[PDB]
Amino acid sequence: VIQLDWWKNCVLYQIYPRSFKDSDGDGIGDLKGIISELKHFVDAGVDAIWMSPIFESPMVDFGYDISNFYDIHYEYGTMEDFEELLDKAHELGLKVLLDFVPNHASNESEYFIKSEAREPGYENFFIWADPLPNPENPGVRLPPSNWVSQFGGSAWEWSEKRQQYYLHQFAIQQVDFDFRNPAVKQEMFNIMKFWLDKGADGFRLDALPYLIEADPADHEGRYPDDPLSGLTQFESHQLGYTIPLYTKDLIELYDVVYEWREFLDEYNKNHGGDTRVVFSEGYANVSMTMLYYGNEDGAIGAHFPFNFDFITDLSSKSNARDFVYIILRWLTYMPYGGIPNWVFGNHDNNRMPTRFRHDMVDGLNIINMLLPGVAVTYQGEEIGMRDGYVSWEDTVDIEACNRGDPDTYHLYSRDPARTPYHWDNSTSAGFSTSTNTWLPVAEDYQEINLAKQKETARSHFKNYQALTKLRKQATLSHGEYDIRALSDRTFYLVRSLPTHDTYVLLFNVSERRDTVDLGRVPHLTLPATVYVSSIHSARLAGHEITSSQLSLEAGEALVLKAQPI
Amino acid sequence: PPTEVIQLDWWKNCVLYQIYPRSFKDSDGDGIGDLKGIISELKHFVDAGVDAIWMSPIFESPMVDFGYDISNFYDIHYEYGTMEDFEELLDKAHELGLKVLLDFVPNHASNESEYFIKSEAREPGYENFFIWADPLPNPENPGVRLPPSNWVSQFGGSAWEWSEKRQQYYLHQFAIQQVDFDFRNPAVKQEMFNIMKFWLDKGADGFRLDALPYLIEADPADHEGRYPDDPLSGLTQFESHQLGYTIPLYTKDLIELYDVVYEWREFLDEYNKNHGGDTRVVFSEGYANVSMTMLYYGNEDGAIGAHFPFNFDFITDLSSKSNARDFVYIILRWLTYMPYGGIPNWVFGNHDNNRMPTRFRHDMVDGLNIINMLLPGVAVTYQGEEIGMRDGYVSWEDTVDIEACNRGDPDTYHLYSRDPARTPYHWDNSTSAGFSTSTNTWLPVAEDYQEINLAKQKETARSHFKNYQALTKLRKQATLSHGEYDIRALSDRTFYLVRSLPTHDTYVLLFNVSERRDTVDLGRVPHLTLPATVYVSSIHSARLAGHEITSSQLSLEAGEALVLKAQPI
Ligand SMILES: OC[C@H]1O[C@H](O)[C@H](O)[C@@H](O)[C@@H]1O
Ligand SMILES: OC[C@H]1O[C@H](O)[C@H](O)[C@@H](O)[C@@H]1O
Ligand SMILES: [Ca+2]
Ligand SMILES: [Ca+2]
Ligand SMILES: [Mg+2]
Ligand SMILES: [Mg+2]
Ligand SMILES: [Mg+2]
Ligand SMILES: [Mg+2]
Ligand SMILES: [Mg+2]
């Protein structure tokens, strides 16, 4: 079995730096805090970390509004702290990826200040458009089109200084670059070269579906209105009012991604050492998601686009057949030679055990680790962290502040998945020496924390460790997969490889006991040994499964070790 | 040597052909297809390698919905013929070794049925045979009559019709003339057993039952003594009289409907036990989400339902918009959701949907028939798919579909009309394509009948029909009846389907569903060892049957499909 390049079967962990570890008692996570817990990634069996943005930012969208793409946000630390983090992560054998959003810059960026001021070379750096006349009151200017921001209201903001509207698909303070401007595309290569020269192992790149919008040149000099959804529940200022035909998934965006990959291939060729990678973010239908890998004209894109299917298409409402059918979607659509990946959460979505159930944490981590390719873990999933309670008063997410009110903010807020990491049962769950955490610590940190799980016989974290260890086995790096539902309640996933041990997941995803015939599972010879069990299972690691009839309790997952095929 | 295999029960791997009798063969020049026409062409099913036929309804009917408005469930519609013609059809079909299934709709009866006439007259035994409801109290305008709820008919307008005679509304999920039975009435349920026993006793091999998602609606007992409003869609393009205004929460897919289906299977199992000979079957129709579709098979409490629900995925979820990955992913949906022991089936068309080559492309006909025949289980063919018939042009003036007449106008009728898929069958290039001796047919014959007709395809070297015969012949091979199946996309353009069975020949479909050429590595296809032989090819393929595939690199044209025969595993 030929050793794979590191990025083909890494365990990749997303750090949300503001909530990982506070080293200096300001209630804000920082780079010295990360550096102090780099050993956690080695202990967990993580190969690679990526951080939510740490570049200079006014923090309107907590780092996704970037005012300087070449330096470190002061609350997180200095360039020297970042250099230390790379150095110490590399000494521990970890890979470190930087995340930034190519789509937009902070309105406090020099790019925007100069563009707004029509400074030479900067006039066309962002999307600038004239108003339309208003038939119903001519004093009230109308925006260039009906386009709606992802955070609600118009995607167009008036600039007093420039006397034009600028485009913002996200917050007012996040200004969309013009990706038809060769100088914008050059600046992206400049930013990437700068951080690759510092020794970064690659990039994650956000909000790619929104890169390119309709060219007014193709619409008689107008920005064309997006079609209406025609749904009475959305007013003109509300996300859902429009279908983003002219504002999302434009085929031209992929050409920008293919150019990024061409640049990275040339960089890897010229510098050698370990491959530097680019992973892309886009929430889009599966066929538009697969174009990030490349196209059938032979274009090559991101090393992979993130697979959000366990966020978008599965929940506690899903049965075992739903689990199998959604897992099959990436495996069916992915190009030949493509690397699969599995994402169970992030700082934009409810935490894994909240979207599913508290009794499904171990089964979900097993799916992540046992499916072919790359396991992606969001901060907290290795200990089963739940959504934290955040009051209206304590809400800081711009999405909730702009779309929501004291009665509705919980429908929109991303803050419950951004509460500080549960290190232990000390003040602020050991995230900080201060009680003044930027978001409130979840109420359950005394029951759910890393230190407790390390000192109990059976725990989500000990299961996580056993599963990342299991990924060293040839059966998981190189083995076939077989996946099928045994019932509406239980499915199996088998990894097999001739002459190497067989590994079988059995998972009752339902709220009721289920009894299955193990004779239905391909490649499973009995007796077999329990390798991992859910923390609530009656079966311990080392338990022998001898009967073909197996009763699984609600949420119960087993990994069995069986005879080689 | 090749292993002995046990022959499957007939219904587990039959080629099932839907006849639309009004459009199949006119024996008497009235431009209307009839039973003597079908009898005259029973040899067509043997020639095609069809095992079983089902007929769109041939029971007495005022023809408001061309047979689906049934006025007598125990006799034959006069335009199609007589009970004697039906007994002759069964006898001759059985002599030729064909199975015959009758289709009828349990959901509703004609307003000209004795059931409805007796019910409207509140006759003993019939007063509660249908859903009858008082107006919704209008305390505000006591002089304005309100229907019981906002429920919308599938053919447009209110699902409630006022009866001056009864001074109540009756429910019709379909046309005004199609009256919904009360399926909580034990006498309605017994009458459905009585209908099935009557036709099984005549010698029918089974039933297809229509419109099952609509059987049961909300009980007013659960809604404080009124019929509850269906929730609103909130779509600005629909007003209260337009299908789409509501979401059918209280009118479709109610869990109690499946108990009726499980009772039908119980009745049939008891009938089979008490009559012996070959199994008589029930196939169910419902257009529903996959979880609600699989409940027709049975439930995980051990209830058993239809021998299978029809799989409409090649109608509802695939089209000319689909790539090879879409094809594979949709095929995997039935295989992933079907219960253990469930027999898979595959439907590419019917009289309610556009014809297969119109929904896909003209260059995809052979590949679509190959998928149908090589997938495990039952292949279902709709009249004309064996010759690649396209939708016929039907003007507003020639439109007779009640759905288009009620929902449509000269500008919009084409959005709704089912008539294009109901045009007369193309036998040959004679008057009215040999469907009729007369130039006057009940729907116009498609303009392409001189290019697309059965006699032409029997006489040309290569044709859709000759490919169809080769594929139904191939289904008798153990590899297709008993073999395993492996399906994956090689690219966005091309997928494989492999049927394999140790000691028996391997068969491989390769299909480029795209509008572009594709080159694939046959080294990636499981169980394929080269050299292999072309068994069937698309009529436009570079490769004739017998062509030797020696290279691992294979270039396929847009729409090109091959079946390869390869050495046993
Ligand atoms: O930058 C706009 C958005 O980009 C990405 O999706 C981020 O994950 C999200 O947090 C941010 O709001
Ligand atoms: O009876 C109502 C409906 O039932 C079935 O779906 C028929 O196939 C359709 O043609 C008819 O209109
Ligand atoms: Ca943009
Ligand atoms: Ca009904
Ligand atoms: Mg700090
Ligand atoms: Mg192009
Ligand atoms: Mg006739
Ligand atoms: Mg209105
Ligand atoms: Mg229709």
Kindly determine whether residue B524 and residue A321, on different chains, have CB atoms separated by under 8 Å: no
- Is it true that B10-106+186-212+253-468 and B482-566 share their CATH fold? no
8 A C-beta contact, residue A48 and residue A12 = yes
At A219, which helix (H) or strand (E)?
none
Q: How many whole angstroms from its chain centre is CA A73?
A: 21
Residue A278 CA to ligand 6 centre (angstroms) = 21
Q: What is the DSSP string of B25-76?
A: --SSSSSS--HHHHHHTHHHHHHHT--EEEES--EE---TTTTSS-SEEEEE
Tell me which residue has its CA closest to atom 11 in ligand 1.
Answer: A64
Resolution of this entry in Å? 1.7
β-strand A95-100 against A202-205: which pairing, if any? parallel
Fold classified for A479-562: Immunoglobulin-like (2.60.40)
* Alpha-carbon distance values, B140 to A211, B97, B228 (Å): 56, 67, 19
Q: How far, in Å, CA of A244 to CA of B367, rounded? A: 35
8 A C-beta contact, residue A344 and residue A364 = yes
From the options 2.60.40.1180, 3.40.50.1110, 1.10.260.40, 2.160.20.60, give the CATH code of B482-566: 2.60.40.1180
Domain ranges of chain B: 10-106+186-212+253-468, 108-180+218-252, 482-566
Fold classified for A104-176+214-244: Oligo-1,6-glucosidase; domain 2 (3.90.400)
Q: What is the DSSP string of A178-214?
A: -TTSHHHHHHHHHHHHHHHHHT--EEEE--GGGS---
Would you call A514 a catalytic residue per the annotation?
no
Phi-psi region of B292 (alpha: psi -120 to 50; beta: other; left: phi over 0): alpha
Tell me which residue has its CA closest to atom 11 in ligand 2.
Answer: B68
Closest CA to A275 of A374, A201, A193, A204: A201
Radius of gyration of chain B (CA): 25
Q: Is the dihedral of CA A230, A231, A232, A233 positive or negative?
A: negative
Residues of A in contact with B232 (CB under 8 A): 232
The answer to whether the bond into A527 is cis (omega within 30° of 0) is yes
DSSP code of residue A304: E
Architecture of domain B10-106+186-212+253-468: Alpha-Beta Barrel (3.20)
8 A C-beta contact, residue A156 and residue A164 = no
At B534, which helix (H) or strand (E)?
strand B532-537
8 A C-beta contact, residue B30 and residue B38 = no
Fold classified for A6-102+182-210+245-463: TIM Barrel (3.20.20)
Establish whether residue A170 lines the binding site of ligand 1, counting it when its CB lies within 6 angstroms of any ligand atom: yes
Residues with CB under 5 A from ligand 7 (ion): B 26, 28, 30, 32, 34
Fold classified for B108-180+218-252: Oligo-1,6-glucosidase; domain 2 (3.90.400)
Residue type, A7: W
Would you call B557 a catalytic residue per the annotation?
no
Burial of B333 from C-beta contacts in 10 A (0-12 / 13-18 / 19+): middle
Q: What is the DSSP string of B422-444?
A: SSPP---SSGGGGS-SSS--SSP
Phi-psi region of A129 (alpha: psi -120 to 50; beta: other; left: phi over 0): beta
Kindly determine whether residue A336 and residue B234, on different chains, have CB atoms separated by under 8 Å: no
- By Cβ distance, the residue of A230, A321, A484 closest to B236 is A230
SS (H, E, C) A242-292: ECCCCCCCCCHHHHHHHHHHHHHHHHHHHHCCCCCEEEECCCCCHHHHHCC
User: Angle CA(B389)–CA(B329)–CA(B300) in degrees, nearest 5?
Assistant: 105
User: Angle CA(B452)–CA(B455)–CA(B459) in degrees, nearest 5?
Assistant: 105
* Cβ count near B127 (within 10 Å): 14
Token pair, residue B162, equals 């006022």
Establish whether residue B210 lines the binding site of ligand 2, counting it when its CB lies within 6 angstroms of any ligand atom: yes
Residue B491 CA to ligand 6 centre (angstroms) = 18
